[PDB]
Design a protein around this ligand. Structure first.
Ligand code: NA
Ligand code: NA
Ligand code: NA
Ligand code: NA
Ligand code: NA
Ligand code: NA
Lengths: 599, 599, 599
């Protein structure tokens, strides 16, 4: 009786108060404590050594308490710990043990989920230091680490990095480092107010599977000149991806260093997301140095249905090698994306591009094996002043990329800087269904719309179609003499080209190759013989030995004669056709022709 | 001891019964009340003045109780209130204070989420009156309103509008009016059984951000002739959108007045949703009157991967101006959508269209600044009887829209009514990869497939490709004499056109323009000179002064001669070519030619 | 007093301990039991007849307990039962009553959700037997069954089928059979480790609506040679679909029998999912035998944005009939998908295909009514050795399918086996914007790239464009003499074709048809007359009576003469053109021409 009151007030009290669900006689006869034990919060571990609850706040380091919670729930086979709403929970010290090597704060454990409803903040203890807030590795050496399985972080809560700048460029900072992560995810969470390297990394060098980031927000996560590099979500295990997320940056430095996503393993995706204020959209890459878990091929890579305002490149393709491993990148789709380069001065940020074929980290452009890429049904726009804007900047070797039914409205279509790298290009396909916008009309003095600054081009198709005039451009397409061109199809539709002095330019007369198939407009001067009746007209110049046929693109203002409608050539390089002199006389005309070779 | 039993039975009783999670000695020593206080439901506020719980039902007005709950949780920094399953919670009176000006029932507050698992119903108090069920404004004047932040409504529950008709057309009704809403969302909820203006509105005149509607259902939300207008989700803040929702209407009135979504600010989206029984799919618009929060440009607008059966127009583009602000709409993508016009009589609902370039609310067609729109990889179908069906109805000024790789199977491709508006059109691009269906073959007597009823057309491309015969149509493309045409490309592929008497029709002979690039089939009568050997053939008519070349589309049934394969023209407007008379004689033939001008 | 202590320890004890939320004086004065009654778990029913809790495990059959829970919550109008984390809950017996006819384990009930956080496992009682784990029918006869409404299964938990093989091929096994299911869903759940027919079926013969599978995983669900057939999610009610799911199989048998999804009713979708190790991606079909609930038309079918590695066919289209009902399939979109055939020997699995137009279950190919299908912006790849790989295998009647802006890199573009079925084909549209890959170059000896093994082809378009050479192929396109061809457009672009001896082959000279529009390259020998000056050249062969024009694709190596640039024909089937002899003499040349008919 005295004993009873004592028991009731003790910590075992709830385990003595009976309960039966809804007074149902067929329900289990339980105690209150059993029902309360069905859920678990940080409050259940956020206490002093005497078991008195501690209130969180800027002067309380909640880390040991949250770790105690995770450790305990782990011991029972898992569950979900709530981080309660209405409170900010500060982290103020590093974790210990296997996450120490990763500058870990909290260690995640398998089957233990975190429902983050309140706020998690970093205390100024972390100012100018490295940190990785949640770490899923159990060993300082990732290679000796066990796995993290079935760990989900979700809720309406917030992870706030406290605004602290990096102390040194060589430091790393992360939000969620899942590790060798299988069936792990982050959903609904806002990551904000920092200077970090990544917010979330999934997998470790290809180890992991079925990891996803969904409906999260990432806001202002780069803030200093010290930050070396930033990729908001790093996907480094297969069968994993990012969808329906929001990414925003406002610092100037983010415009030069920040990427929203990097996809590094096969069967990965980046979809339905919105990006603003970033340098880059996504890197899609097989790095040989990360091929341990899932092989040396990145394939089945999808970037789709995203909205972006960026300052540099939207999708960056790459692959590289080590002494013992070669990376390969193939079977990629980039579709449905609507992307623009934000308002900025020309050359004030990394060169603007929808697609970039980038060299490796050390700058090499002769190691890449990138092929079977499909770029379709995207829109891209860059303001008229941004000289450094291209549909594709093709700066390293390329083994194939196909463009169909895009709308590109920027300065260049295909570009590479001259006197830089000399890529070897195979299987570049630019279908006639790509629409070329007019924003940059009149801005292109001295410039080639397709500036083919390559070592060589093979098995490629460029079908140029203009949709408005731009008489400022030097040419629609130009190949320098140093670029070999073979087994290719290069065509310039004549619409909007009547006043262009150059349409297609082959500085090494590469269009004469045996398996080169071309057509483009040119102006040609012809002279006829004096014969009345059917009469030959011949070109005054002799540079047409490669031409298989040509046809008139000009009206005939004359009554007394007509030039040929169509022409062939002669061994000396003249064109020759048969027109008609109603009355005799030598004729001399200047005609716009469509020159054709094997087409 | 007497005291103890008394305390235990009192409302402080649970705060005297000890608990320690799973009997863990390292866990907090708490009381039962602490653990129960981790969650909160409507039951905790749904009581009389003496604190006795009240059962909800049709004769209980739950509004003050739910408001008390929201107000209180707000006071503690937020949390989630559950609306319990297994009950219907009726609302029976208006709210008071700052939501009174919005005919508000409940006021939402920042960080207070609603987990709606049961049903929320409106009582007949609201019959024939305005209402807005949940309101996030805190002031009758939205301009003087504070913000709503971090408010999420979610669950498997239902909001039921009680079926009440509108009392008067000028009334407004809404479900969730979030207000100046930042990081607010609605997920999983069914909205049903009403006559409202909107179900959900996000933002206020551009104020707001990161607001989303996901996996909701909207069922039968228009039911009367009184309802002036309906848009189910109104997106009026940037970085916000609708995805994976279901929209259905069954009333006849919805076919004439209801739109599923309106996107009114930049960086907004409408994706992966299914629509049935609506007039319209989405309005995508910059209204100058709503440009306060986020600027006067709507850009980065995405409508993708939706399934719709509608009765009017799928996507409606617009922009307008006020005395001091001009709205602009650019950088839009419409892709992957599969849309049909439901079974209906011709002209029985608003004119059927995949894309509509609509005039402003007052009807003006000369204020719009719409450009950089990409319409790609969509399907559209309208039944054969629906005369009023078009890929695009282009009824107001247009500064650009690009169509690539769509499949359109309806009556018209491009349409505008004659004797209505006379749009000024720039940069309309209709790529040859648009496939034109055959459902309406034989229905097109008196009709032009592309009926270009415009003031002018510039920098436009129409590349017509048929995929089956339709000899009923008057022409594939017709320009009236009142339409100026310049710096454009207009082509009709010859497949399926051999028996057409008109292919392309330029009623003002606009194809003669200096920067007009055209080609289309025509039948031409020619006569030759009598000369044996190479011999000229000339057209009997003189209307070909604009033709730069022509070539045969007919076989030659003759042995003793052949007409020219190719033709040019003469100053008098004749065509002229060189054929061959094996035997002499004047020849007279009627040949199908491809007429070409600068192409 | 003695009484009080007794009451407190009894099962009514919690109903005597007072509580008021957060000590708020305006809150309801409740008892602890009321707050605990807001939630419900399996623990509340998992007890013996004396009400003592039973621990789950391999030797406890949890089925009756979970059924008791569902039944009870159903009685109160619904709610959500948690299946707790940290435990495995074994099922060990069949259910009773209306689910007995479906070999049901558990009966789902309306408004009763399951939050599965722990694991549900099948005990060896089910080895070699049929089962359907969760069943939503309430009657052994589905036709006499009531509906299941508002039933959601969700959580981070697992359903594990115990690895048991099927006992006999005629057995059926399912995970979730929702029945006549309205507003039902499964979200987040992993289904693994079995040999089943389906994991989830939605609807019953068209009865149902708004059923969805989202963010689930399906892993290793076929494991034996006994299994007759497998479709992981079967969508058999309208306004329903699958999105963001993961499907994986590892058994060899799955490569031959398993499909990820089947869509069987209108307004259904399959999006954003990843598939590996399956035979097939999706069946998209109207089966007449299932047209009871939602009509005999499957329309508004969407397969989009999926990633797949399969061994057979990606999307299979079909429709069939019964004695009284005819099924129709129309208005389908397949877009944005990136698909490959996995590494395998040629012919070692069902024939590889992006699209398959399949015969019915009994093998008939003359019952299908499939039209208005759009296949756009997809990628497909098959390794070079896989002879049995096609963009489309067209094996049954087809009333229309449109391909635009795909990238297909496999052995065939269009294929049907000769000496099999003889489909009747209408409205097959293959736009020039389809890019044909080069992986299979040099592998095509004896093969036609487009092998048109049909009864007939009408109102079809094939526009062949190569992007690299493949001189191994017999032809780019071949029609056998048995295939009628009319009102069609067939073109072969000349790029990469200069060395091909056959480009287009019409074994029945079908290109001569009145409404056939063709063009393709050919080599032609010509001889001229001896006349100096304008001089005719004529073909030595007479097989060109169908040719309307031809033009040179070869250079002229000669100085003293030129052949015609362009040719027409003569009644005897010769070609004839006018060239020029600078000096007289009979000329004899062999020229590559583009032959054109009505184009
Ligand atoms: Na490709
Ligand atoms: Na070179
Ligand atoms: Na555009
Ligand atoms: Na005019
Ligand atoms: Na179609
Ligand atoms: Na036949």
């Amino acid at each position: 009786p005295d004993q009873f009151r004592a028991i009731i007030e003790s910590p075992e009290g709830a385990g003595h108060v009976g309960y039966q669900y809804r007074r149902n006689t067929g329900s289990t006869m339980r105690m209150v404590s059993d029902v309360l034990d069905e859920r678990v919060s940080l409050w259940d571990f956020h206490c002093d050594p005497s078991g008195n609850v501690i209130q969180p706040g800027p002067n309380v380091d909640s880390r040991q308490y949250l770790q105690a919670a995770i450790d305990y729930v782990s011991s029972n086979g898992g569950g979900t710990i709530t981080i309660p709403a209405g409170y900010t929970w500060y982290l103020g010290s590093y974790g210990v043990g296997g996450i120490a090597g990763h500058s870990g704060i909290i260690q995640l454990r398998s089957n233990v989920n975190l429902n983050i409803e309140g706020r998690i903040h970093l205390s100024p203890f972390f100012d100018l230091k490295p940190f990785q807030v949640f770490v899923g590795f159990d060993n300082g050496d990732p290679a000796s680490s066990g796995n993290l399985e079935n760990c989900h972080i979700y809720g309406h809560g917030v992870v706030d990095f406290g605004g602290y700048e990096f102390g040194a460029s060589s430091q790393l900072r992360n939000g969620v480092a899942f590790g060798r992560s299988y069936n792990c995810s982050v959903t609904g969470i806002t990551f904000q107010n920092g200077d970090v390297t990544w917010a979330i990394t999934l997998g470790w060098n290809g180890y992991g599977s079925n990891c996803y980031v969904r409906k999260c927000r990432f806001i202002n996560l780069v803030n200093s000149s010290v930050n070396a590099a930033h990729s908001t979500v790093y996907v480094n295990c297969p069968y994993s991806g990012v969808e329906s997320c929001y990414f925003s940056m406002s610092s100037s430095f983010a415009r030069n260093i920040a990427c929203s996503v990097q996809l590094h393993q096969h069967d990965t995706f980046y979809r339905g997301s919105t990006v603003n204020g970033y340098c880059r959209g996504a890197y899609v890459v097989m790095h040989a140095a990360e091929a341990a878990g899932a092989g040396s091929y990145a394939y089945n890579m999808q970037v789709e249905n995203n909205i972006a305002v960026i300052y540099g490149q939207f999708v960056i393709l790459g692959s590289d090698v080590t002494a013992t491993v070669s990376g390969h990148l193939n079977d990629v789709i980039v579709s449905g994306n609507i992307v623009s380069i934000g308002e900025r001065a020309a050359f004030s940020a990394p060169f603007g591009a929808f697609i970039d074929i980038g060299p490796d980290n050390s700058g090499a452009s002769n190691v890449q094996d990138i092929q079977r890429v499909l770029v379709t049904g995207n829109s891209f726009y860059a303001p008229a002043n941004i000289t450094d804007s291209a549909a594709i900047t093709l700066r390293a070797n390329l083994n194939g990329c196909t463009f169909i039914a895009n709308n590109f409205d920027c300065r260049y279509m295909v570009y590479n800087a001259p006197g830089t790298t000399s890529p070897v290009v195979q299987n570049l396909v630019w279908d006639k269904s790509n629409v070329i916008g007019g924003t940059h009309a009149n801005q292109r003095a001295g410039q080639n719309l397709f500036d083919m600054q390559f070592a060589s081009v093979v098995n490629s198709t460029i079908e140029v179609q203009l949709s408005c005039e731009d008489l400022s451009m030097f040419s629609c397409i130009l190949f320098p003499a140093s670029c070999q061109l073979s087994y290719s199809k290069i065509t310039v539709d004549s619409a909007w080209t009547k006043s262009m002095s150059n349409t297609a330019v082959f500085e090494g007369n590469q269009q004469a190759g045996a398996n080169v198939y071309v057509s483009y407009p040119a102006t040609v001067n012809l002279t006829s013989y004096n014969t009345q009746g059917a009469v030959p007209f011949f070109s005054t110049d002799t540079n047409y030995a490669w031409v298989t046929s040509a046809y008139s693109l000009s009206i005939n203002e004359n009554l007394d004669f007509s030039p040929p409608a169509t022409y062939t050539n002669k061994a000396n390089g003249q064109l020759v056709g048969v027109g008609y002199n109603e009355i005799g006389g030598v004729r001399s005309v200047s005609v716009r022709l469509m020159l054709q070779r094997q087409v």
